[PDB]
């Protein structure tokens, strides 16, 4: 009973490509509670509405959170082919989803800011022919194949990473490039929610 | 019994070549400076109106080094307090004068010590670099927008080149590229953090008590290279409320796996940009084509639009990959590419097709693509008469590649065989520049009928002057070495009698893709040597030389100091057995690479040469910069090409110098070919007991081209040459 | 028709001068090296015993650069892996070999890169400097005691000199002074924190890709000077339990009010030390006499024991104040002082009385005090025949100043007129060294009877060799300029006919207190020039020269570049009108100050001189170091002597060089007279259109004295001189 | 009642040439109290004994304290002509005096150590003749005339100080030179006591 949003408030929200995932089965949620802590700048959903997503009961609720600048709102879209959907963070298209942009006030102090905002602007493989470049696109509910070579925070805008592949891994190379956006006065975050409606298992309901 | 062309004549510039420099401001108008007045000439009529009185700034309070007029005539940029750095770099102050207000702009000025300034291609936007950061002015009298905050002296370069990119890649100090209508500003960022410094002394005026040590990040062969990143900023989305968003375009994955360079930036359309990247091992390069995304505001570079270019016999391009010339719709482009026979021709590309289509062929080469229309491609080449040292303007019909017209071959075929061209804004008109064999000639033409409008400068005054002086003659011809033509030129003394025997000076450069034999008319030191001192000054283009296909150009691949050295010797052999050459009076001299080859020849032990002069020579390849050296030599490692690096030093041959008289000259402030190189030559000669002549030039760079120094070095070389030749 | 002394003879050292170097180890014994064996010779008998077989270290594993035997014969210090720095400085490795154990000491060794090592004067204590800190070993195989912890490269110097103290004050790298029986170790600390760096390139081997920039704290005229502090440590109170207590002795208050130097350190007794301090304006100096306090363990310097020395016509001393020579009880001392006539004589001091008493007088000078006993003072002077370029040994009786005996004037008056002396530990015996006019002669003597024991080296083998070669002759004489004798020497070609007319080379130094005219026998370049090339090589000591009183020496005070320059010209005038000199073939050449004067003469416009060679010349005084320059010139400020600084540059006279042929030579690694100086000369000549000959020597210091470089420069100067003189 | 040794325990004992002076009139003293805080290394008195100086009553007690190294004990003497008596600290010869060398333990923490121990090793005047040097000796119960030009702690061993004098001050110069001794593990201090026996005013007595 009562859904545990704890570890979100304590520490530093990771970068979009290292998004942390909170899973919710069998509990009650006050979400308008959670969204009353932050200052909320944008709320769009797919196959659901923000009104609806507070009200309904579900069999499964997934909350993904990360640091993310408001300046890059046009790239955090369900209908977007920017670097974010390509190489960083992709939601499922088969479940209803919501995307929240917020700003931690000052009043909230247990949430620490990192050096800067970072994201992956290139993730590709160079085949063993030394010619063919194949972008490695991120699949929903997964991390980029480049998170193994891209630091948790990018040191400088435009840095690039490489790693030669074993003949078993396919040969050729793995290659990535990181981008940065300057840290803001108040930290800015991104939230991605995904709901599953069950048959009989709708044990994730709001509370009253 | 007329006078001769004297050394004094060459140094005082008594016999001047006139020019005609213009700036096309539209498709039918251009600016000219006449009696310090700036005029605008209409191409059609030839009528002119005054654009700027010479008096306008005769109350400025400064000397005005250079000026730049905005593309819309509204503003003029005034450059004063100029201080030189490298071949293309400097700092200065700038003022902006309003041409409508007829006033100076006094507020929000471009700071002192500004490193570079450029107008947008249309309108009057400004981009400038100050303290290694980029700034943009939309309106000239309003505050600037700071684009970059990472600039740092000798470390981070935003919008300007570092030493090696300036000298060996862009041939320019600037690393800014405006989109055609100035909406976007593309720029490079260089990182010299881990690049070793070359350090040297600068002495300056007497009054400076302690010398200054100059420190320049400079990668010698195999050293750590600078790093590069590329960005595009929308100059129309700028605001004083937020910091600018520079969108990065990353290099292709084939480059990111190792060391690489950015080698070309060319805009295709208002929203399409092409980039060429080059691997450190320079026989692999990729073009990237990038489109602006009007929704996201980013730049997408489709992998399917990549164009790989790679060499199996040497490096890519002459010095670097060629620049593409895009059709108006940017969906196809023309580019100079070496063909299956090794000759450089125009190839036609589709931005998403791998294979290209040659539109020119032959055993001659396209020198450059000069203009493109919907109907015609304009280019310079050496096809005429199979003379590789000749240049003519051609136009080829796009609908029919067999319809090529030569626009210059026929205008003045006796006087003019070396042409360059300047086109108006839609190639409606063009200015032609004849550089020889006769006196330079400047003419105006319309492209529509290829009708000759008029003569701009014919150099009649000089022709008039040169009738009262015994001028030398120039022979341009070739010899045949195992079934191959090799061109040479000879500057012949007046009243040349081929039964007599003349002393010969070999003027040599001989670097890869060099050309010392051409149809250009020149008034230089060799003129005086022939006119006054009766010396035959000869040059020879052997293996490694350019514009005659890759079999010749790639000959010296991974073996500089071999063939191009030998052929200079063999050329001297050939010359002597023509019968008018005193074989006991053959000298040789060269600057930079020419200085290297000169030295290598003097230490060959061939006994063909009696004396020689090396000016700022390379002495060993590991002392020279990475980009140039590794292009031809690879890396100086045992796994690669260390052997040929060590086999090709001047010092190695110190012993042989006992047979020759040697003059070694070098400037102390040479940041290009470091004084070091000569210091190592002289030290090896000392260590082996060889006497020689030396001369340093304190505070002179690679050019040794200050007024006094220039006169001094030529005077000194004159004495040395006359003395070796037992001349009065 | 015998052979000549050839250039080859001079450079290959075909005709060797033998020597006899010994080291007195007691009052009647000394060490000599004979066939690589070290022997001890008894002074009386002349019998010898072997001290060290040459074979002893023929299994060492290193080449042995130098050795030092402990004062008690128990230990030998072995110097290997030596690497040079300045004129007196270097680093090396050291081993210590036990002479009784006949073994190498393997534990607690002196570290590599040790900067200096010295035995105590008795016993076998060691003081060494490593990383600018002082260390002491009481027993050689036991751990060392660290005396100082403040050492820091180029900043803090403990027990070693910085650049300027090494060159211009102590003429040594070491700044350590053991008390007589090695109880105390006195030392200086120098602070170069705020002293500007001279920086220059070093190129090293071919294989070094980037040149190194050498940085040396070096105060040019008027710059910030190094700071100095003085300490004494008791080496008998050392312990591994506590850090050593260095007792400071502060300078006198008359020095502390402004910039000053430590100029002399001389122990008087086992518990009394004398210090001389010198003001930056060097016409004021103070001796401090300090006694050890056996209760407190400190050093008290009684104000009543201070001895002020100060000049009103120039600077104090010849180059620095003279060192005192104390009586055994340390209550009185002898010191060389300029008298009321300006001549340098021996004065007798009481440590608490201001006034001193002259014990010598005359129009000649004491060169140095060599030994002191209870009965006799021994000194070298030029009294004999009023020849200032002669040297003899004298002894004066302490009870009767009229009882002076000349110990050398009479031994071999024809062959020997230039003597130096080496005394045994109580002046019971002395070795005499004759340096000319004849072949050098080394003899042994006892002081008791002034009896000559024996001849050590007579150079008979060389005399034998030199009979088969046409050797030149040397004239030493004077001329009279407004009532003053001025000495010169001439090296005359063999078969000299004074009716013929010879070309003349002026060999010049001419710095303050210089002496180029003497009785020394030499085998050098001038020998070859006269023997083989029939050139008269002449030198002349004019105003500013030394050992003839202050009227001549102080003449150039605050006006270097004036009188001493003129007199060199006037000397050439005088020489030509003797009638055997070709007045169309007079050249001039000089190194360092000689290079300065040579240049100043060539730009005089006197037309007396046809050509000239400047090697590493000074060109302007503000480029040279503070200690030397300010001694003669003062500060380069308007309040002081800026005018004469600016009036006395070579560059100023660039124009006049059009009348002369000029050779300018300089080493790139000259830390003494910086390459800068020549760089400024050549630049001014270029800026004014004068041609000249130049030659740099890469990586050579002020001496240009590496084997190869030395041959190279002399060979090159030979050609230049022969060419100016129209010689075959 | 009860003598106030307070400001000694709180702070950094100054250097010998800046010795701080505590005056005592009309109070009771437990001195064996004070000397039980410190570890005491030497106790010598002149014209009195350490036994006697605890017991007697006085009309005036002066306590002078400063930082001072045990290594320099031979220089802190009533019978000494070192730099300490010459230029730093001199007691009266007309009153009975005591000299105490001590070491603050660890147990005592309100007493802070300075960078190093410093003392004056030269204090002299250079007369207006530029030749005559006259040492400026410190008089009892006074500071050195050089404390105006010598820093409260000497920066480096052997530093020297100068100050030109006004024609009214005598002309010429004032000159000084400072010495240093390395700071110790436990701070080491110096105490100088001077007692005056009054006629009837003996109001400074011990307590019981
Ligand atoms: C060149 O001359 C032509 C006319 O011969 C100029 O063009 C005209 O200028 C007149 C003013 O006299 C205008 O009223 C017309 O409308 C213009 N006609 C055109 C061609 O548009 C032209 O200004 C002159 N150009 C220069 C550079 O002086
Ligand atoms: C220069 O080119 C840019 C890029 O195409 C033009 O900007 C576009 O103009 C259209 C029509 O106004 C707009 O709908 C687009 O949104 C614009 N794109 C951007 C990125 O601004 C611009 O019009 C041209 N500028 C000039 C001076 O003609
Ligand atoms: C020089 O010879 C003398 C004797 O002629 C040596 O002195 C004596 O040496 C003998 C051994 O033969 C001793 O027994 C005597 O006691 C010595 N007498 C003296 C002078 O003290 C002396 O050792 C020899 N010196 C050298 C350096 O070989
Ligand atoms: C070297 O000289 C020192 C200084 O005089 C001598 O040391 C003194 O010796 C006497 C007699 O033993 C002692 O009473 C003093 O206390 C010593 N003074 C010091 C500072 O040590 C010493 O004896 C001499 N050394 C040798 C090797 O003879
Ligand atoms: C400016 O133009 C006038 C036009 O007559 C000309 O005479 C004058 O020489 C020019 N002034 C300069 C500085 O060239
Ligand atoms: C440039 O420097 C000059 C000279 O100091 C100064 O007068 C002027 O204000 C500067 N200009 C700007 C734009 O700051
Ligand atoms: C050492 O001494 C012997 C004595 O006969 C001599 O012959 C030999 O040449 C010497 N060895 C060296 C290295 O000088
Ligand atoms: C000096 O250097 C050599 C060479 O590296 C080394 O073998 C030796 O141990 C060093 N000697 C000392 C005293 O450390």
PDB file of C-alpha atoms in Angstrom, chain B residues 14-168:
ATOM      1  CA  UNK B  14      61.870  49.752 -60.840  1.00  0.00           C
ATOM      2  CA  UNK B  15      59.956  47.851 -63.543  1.00  0.00           C
ATOM      3  CA  UNK B  16      56.435  47.311 -62.168  1.00  0.00           C
ATOM      4  CA  UNK B  17      53.815  44.808 -63.289  1.00  0.00           C
ATOM      5  CA  UNK B  18      50.363  46.423 -63.253  1.00  0.00           C
ATOM      6  CA  UNK B  19      47.335  44.444 -62.136  1.00  0.00           C
ATOM      7  CA  UNK B  20      43.579  44.766 -62.120  1.00  0.00           C
ATOM      8  CA  UNK B  21      41.925  43.548 -58.936  1.00  0.00           C
ATOM      9  CA  UNK B  22      38.165  43.764 -58.798  1.00  0.00           C
ATOM     10  CA  UNK B  23      35.384  42.513 -56.534  1.00  0.00           C
ATOM     11  CA  UNK B  24      32.120  41.323 -58.068  1.00  0.00           C
ATOM     12  CA  UNK B  25      29.278  42.651 -55.920  1.00  0.00           C
ATOM     13  CA  UNK B  26      26.491  41.424 -58.226  1.00  0.00           C
ATOM     14  CA  UNK B  27      25.943  39.465 -61.466  1.00  0.00           C
ATOM     15  CA  UNK B  28      27.049  42.474 -63.549  1.00  0.00           C
ATOM     16  CA  UNK B  29      28.865  44.962 -61.298  1.00  0.00           C
ATOM     17  CA  UNK B  30      32.242  45.071 -59.597  1.00  0.00           C
ATOM     18  CA  UNK B  31      34.362  47.369 -57.431  1.00  0.00           C
ATOM     19  CA  UNK B  32      37.700  48.825 -58.486  1.00  0.00           C
ATOM     20  CA  UNK B  33      40.239  51.074 -56.785  1.00  0.00           C
ATOM     21  CA  UNK B  34      41.407  53.890 -59.093  1.00  0.00           C
ATOM     22  CA  UNK B  35      43.577  56.702 -57.689  1.00  0.00           C
ATOM     23  CA  UNK B  36      42.654  55.538 -54.165  1.00  0.00           C
ATOM     24  CA  UNK B  37      38.982  55.976 -55.051  1.00  0.00           C
ATOM     25  CA  UNK B  38      36.654  52.997 -54.957  1.00  0.00           C
ATOM     26  CA  UNK B  39      34.472  52.856 -58.055  1.00  0.00           C
ATOM     27  CA  UNK B  40      31.678  50.556 -59.166  1.00  0.00           C
ATOM     28  CA  UNK B  41      31.832  49.548 -62.831  1.00  0.00           C
ATOM     29  CA  UNK B  42      28.823  48.173 -64.698  1.00  0.00           C
ATOM     30  CA  UNK B  43      29.881  45.086 -66.684  1.00  0.00           C
ATOM     31  CA  UNK B  44      27.685  45.727 -69.726  1.00  0.00           C
ATOM     32  CA  UNK B  45      28.124  49.457 -70.388  1.00  0.00           C
ATOM     33  CA  UNK B  46      31.528  49.917 -68.780  1.00  0.00           C
ATOM     34  CA  UNK B  47      30.205  53.121 -67.267  1.00  0.00           C
ATOM     35  CA  UNK B  48      31.307  53.799 -63.704  1.00  0.00           C
ATOM     36  CA  UNK B  49      30.099  55.727 -60.677  1.00  0.00           C
ATOM     37  CA  UNK B  50      32.189  56.724 -57.652  1.00  0.00           C
ATOM     38  CA  UNK B  51      31.482  54.485 -54.654  1.00  0.00           C
ATOM     39  CA  UNK B  52      33.976  55.981 -52.181  1.00  0.00           C
ATOM     40  CA  UNK B  53      36.097  59.127 -52.348  1.00  0.00           C
ATOM     41  CA  UNK B  54      39.720  58.662 -51.259  1.00  0.00           C
ATOM     42  CA  UNK B  55      39.207  61.630 -48.929  1.00  0.00           C
ATOM     43  CA  UNK B  56      36.528  59.928 -46.782  1.00  0.00           C
ATOM     44  CA  UNK B  57      38.996  58.645 -44.197  1.00  0.00           C
ATOM     45  CA  UNK B  58      41.623  61.383 -44.533  1.00  0.00           C
ATOM     46  CA  UNK B  59      40.564  62.407 -41.015  1.00  0.00           C
ATOM     47  CA  UNK B  60      40.509  58.952 -39.440  1.00  0.00           C
ATOM     48  CA  UNK B  61      43.452  59.207 -37.044  1.00  0.00           C
ATOM     49  CA  UNK B  62      44.965  55.890 -38.125  1.00  0.00           C
ATOM     50  CA  UNK B  63      46.666  54.302 -41.097  1.00  0.00           C
ATOM     51  CA  UNK B  64      44.229  51.928 -42.816  1.00  0.00           C
ATOM     52  CA  UNK B  65      45.742  48.497 -43.554  1.00  0.00           C
ATOM     53  CA  UNK B  66      42.763  46.834 -45.256  1.00  0.00           C
ATOM     54  CA  UNK B  67      39.055  47.431 -45.842  1.00  0.00           C
ATOM     55  CA  UNK B  68      35.992  45.267 -46.479  1.00  0.00           C
ATOM     56  CA  UNK B  69      32.658  46.481 -47.791  1.00  0.00           C
ATOM     57  CA  UNK B  70      29.483  44.688 -46.663  1.00  0.00           C
ATOM     58  CA  UNK B  71      27.789  42.703 -49.502  1.00  0.00           C
ATOM     59  CA  UNK B  72      24.942  45.261 -49.522  1.00  0.00           C
ATOM     60  CA  UNK B  73      27.035  48.426 -49.704  1.00  0.00           C
ATOM     61  CA  UNK B  74      25.663  49.791 -46.436  1.00  0.00           C
ATOM     62  CA  UNK B  75      28.774  49.318 -44.301  1.00  0.00           C
ATOM     63  CA  UNK B  76      32.548  49.357 -44.597  1.00  0.00           C
ATOM     64  CA  UNK B  77      34.876  47.492 -42.249  1.00  0.00           C
ATOM     65  CA  UNK B  78      38.107  49.377 -41.514  1.00  0.00           C
ATOM     66  CA  UNK B  79      41.205  47.410 -40.486  1.00  0.00           C
ATOM     67  CA  UNK B  80      43.952  49.323 -38.662  1.00  0.00           C
ATOM     68  CA  UNK B  81      46.730  48.543 -36.138  1.00  0.00           C
ATOM     69  CA  UNK B  82      47.509  45.302 -37.961  1.00  0.00           C
ATOM     70  CA  UNK B  83      50.128  42.937 -36.513  1.00  0.00           C
ATOM     71  CA  UNK B  84      51.236  39.828 -38.468  1.00  0.00           C
ATOM     72  CA  UNK B  85      51.541  36.264 -37.126  1.00  0.00           C
ATOM     73  CA  UNK B  86      51.757  33.361 -39.635  1.00  0.00           C
ATOM     74  CA  UNK B  87      51.275  33.146 -43.440  1.00  0.00           C
ATOM     75  CA  UNK B  88      47.566  34.055 -43.168  1.00  0.00           C
ATOM     76  CA  UNK B  89      47.076  34.978 -39.473  1.00  0.00           C
ATOM     77  CA  UNK B  90      47.196  38.342 -37.630  1.00  0.00           C
ATOM     78  CA  UNK B  91      45.451  40.654 -35.137  1.00  0.00           C
ATOM     79  CA  UNK B  92      44.115  44.226 -35.552  1.00  0.00           C
ATOM     80  CA  UNK B  93      41.588  46.841 -34.594  1.00  0.00           C
ATOM     81  CA  UNK B  94      38.426  47.342 -36.620  1.00  0.00           C
ATOM     82  CA  UNK B  95      35.995  50.225 -37.006  1.00  0.00           C
ATOM     83  CA  UNK B  96      32.688  50.135 -38.871  1.00  0.00           C
ATOM     84  CA  UNK B  97      31.648  53.123 -40.948  1.00  0.00           C
ATOM     85  CA  UNK B  98      27.988  53.590 -41.955  1.00  0.00           C
ATOM     86  CA  UNK B  99      27.816  54.491 -45.655  1.00  0.00           C
ATOM     87  CA  UNK B 100      24.288  55.936 -45.510  1.00  0.00           C
ATOM     88  CA  UNK B 101      24.759  57.874 -42.256  1.00  0.00           C
ATOM     89  CA  UNK B 102      28.233  58.709 -43.573  1.00  0.00           C
ATOM     90  CA  UNK B 103      29.448  58.331 -39.969  1.00  0.00           C
ATOM     91  CA  UNK B 104      31.665  56.082 -37.843  1.00  0.00           C
ATOM     92  CA  UNK B 105      29.941  53.564 -35.541  1.00  0.00           C
ATOM     93  CA  UNK B 106      31.192  54.457 -32.053  1.00  0.00           C
ATOM     94  CA  UNK B 107      29.300  52.032 -29.813  1.00  0.00           C
ATOM     95  CA  UNK B 108      29.460  48.269 -29.242  1.00  0.00           C
ATOM     96  CA  UNK B 109      32.690  48.188 -31.264  1.00  0.00           C
ATOM     97  CA  UNK B 110      34.721  45.203 -32.386  1.00  0.00           C
ATOM     98  CA  UNK B 111      37.395  44.827 -29.652  1.00  0.00           C
ATOM     99  CA  UNK B 112      41.108  45.463 -30.193  1.00  0.00           C
ATOM    100  CA  UNK B 113      43.322  42.420 -30.823  1.00  0.00           C
ATOM    101  CA  UNK B 114      40.557  40.863 -32.890  1.00  0.00           C
ATOM    102  CA  UNK B 115      41.899  37.782 -34.691  1.00  0.00           C
ATOM    103  CA  UNK B 116      39.496  37.576 -37.644  1.00  0.00           C
ATOM    104  CA  UNK B 117      36.365  39.255 -39.033  1.00  0.00           C
ATOM    105  CA  UNK B 118      34.065  38.271 -41.905  1.00  0.00           C
ATOM    106  CA  UNK B 119      30.827  39.627 -43.371  1.00  0.00           C
ATOM    107  CA  UNK B 120      27.901  37.291 -44.049  1.00  0.00           C
ATOM    108  CA  UNK B 121      27.759  36.516 -47.787  1.00  0.00           C
ATOM    109  CA  UNK B 122      24.577  38.622 -48.177  1.00  0.00           C
ATOM    110  CA  UNK B 123      23.538  41.653 -46.096  1.00  0.00           C
ATOM    111  CA  UNK B 124      25.765  42.917 -43.284  1.00  0.00           C
ATOM    112  CA  UNK B 125      26.033  40.358 -40.479  1.00  0.00           C
ATOM    113  CA  UNK B 126      29.463  40.091 -38.817  1.00  0.00           C
ATOM    114  CA  UNK B 127      31.233  37.105 -37.329  1.00  0.00           C
ATOM    115  CA  UNK B 128      34.503  37.840 -35.564  1.00  0.00           C
ATOM    116  CA  UNK B 129      37.025  35.994 -33.423  1.00  0.00           C
ATOM    117  CA  UNK B 130      38.438  37.595 -30.318  1.00  0.00           C
ATOM    118  CA  UNK B 131      40.419  35.679 -27.685  1.00  0.00           C
ATOM    119  CA  UNK B 132      39.672  32.392 -29.502  1.00  0.00           C
ATOM    120  CA  UNK B 133      35.914  32.823 -29.202  1.00  0.00           C
ATOM    121  CA  UNK B 134      33.333  33.548 -31.892  1.00  0.00           C
ATOM    122  CA  UNK B 135      31.079  36.613 -31.742  1.00  0.00           C
ATOM    123  CA  UNK B 136      28.231  37.606 -34.100  1.00  0.00           C
ATOM    124  CA  UNK B 137      26.729  41.023 -34.864  1.00  0.00           C
ATOM    125  CA  UNK B 138      23.378  41.031 -36.658  1.00  0.00           C
ATOM    126  CA  UNK B 139      23.181  44.817 -36.706  1.00  0.00           C
ATOM    127  CA  UNK B 140      26.615  46.513 -36.629  1.00  0.00           C
ATOM    128  CA  UNK B 141      25.820  49.120 -33.930  1.00  0.00           C
ATOM    129  CA  UNK B 142      24.176  46.640 -31.513  1.00  0.00           C
ATOM    130  CA  UNK B 143      25.841  44.361 -28.916  1.00  0.00           C
ATOM    131  CA  UNK B 144      27.422  41.133 -30.187  1.00  0.00           C
ATOM    132  CA  UNK B 145      26.268  37.595 -29.369  1.00  0.00           C
ATOM    133  CA  UNK B 146      28.935  35.370 -27.843  1.00  0.00           C
ATOM    134  CA  UNK B 147      28.790  31.997 -29.581  1.00  0.00           C
ATOM    135  CA  UNK B 148      31.585  30.159 -27.721  1.00  0.00           C
ATOM    136  CA  UNK B 149      32.937  30.324 -24.149  1.00  0.00           C
ATOM    137  CA  UNK B 150      35.698  27.694 -24.415  1.00  0.00           C
ATOM    138  CA  UNK B 151      38.368  29.772 -26.207  1.00  0.00           C
ATOM    139  CA  UNK B 152      41.864  29.547 -24.721  1.00  0.00           C
ATOM    140  CA  UNK B 153      45.191  30.808 -26.108  1.00  0.00           C
ATOM    141  CA  UNK B 154      47.261  28.017 -27.692  1.00  0.00           C
ATOM    142  CA  UNK B 155      44.701  25.435 -26.500  1.00  0.00           C
ATOM    143  CA  UNK B 156      41.139  25.797 -27.748  1.00  0.00           C
ATOM    144  CA  UNK B 157      40.547  27.485 -31.119  1.00  0.00           C
ATOM    145  CA  UNK B 158      36.945  28.384 -31.993  1.00  0.00           C
ATOM    146  CA  UNK B 159      36.484  29.648 -35.549  1.00  0.00           C
ATOM    147  CA  UNK B 160      40.197  30.089 -36.226  1.00  0.00           C
ATOM    148  CA  UNK B 161      42.787  27.489 -37.292  1.00  0.00           C
ATOM    149  CA  UNK B 162      45.742  26.353 -35.189  1.00  0.00           C
ATOM    150  CA  UNK B 163      49.227  26.400 -36.796  1.00  0.00           C
ATOM    151  CA  UNK B 164      48.993  23.120 -38.725  1.00  0.00           C
ATOM    152  CA  UNK B 165      45.416  23.559 -39.983  1.00  0.00           C
ATOM    153  CA  UNK B 166      46.335  27.042 -41.177  1.00  0.00           C
ATOM    154  CA  UNK B 167      49.406  25.899 -43.080  1.00  0.00           C
ATOM    155  CA  UNK B 168      48.605  22.411 -44.240  1.00  0.00           C
TER     156      UNK B 168
END
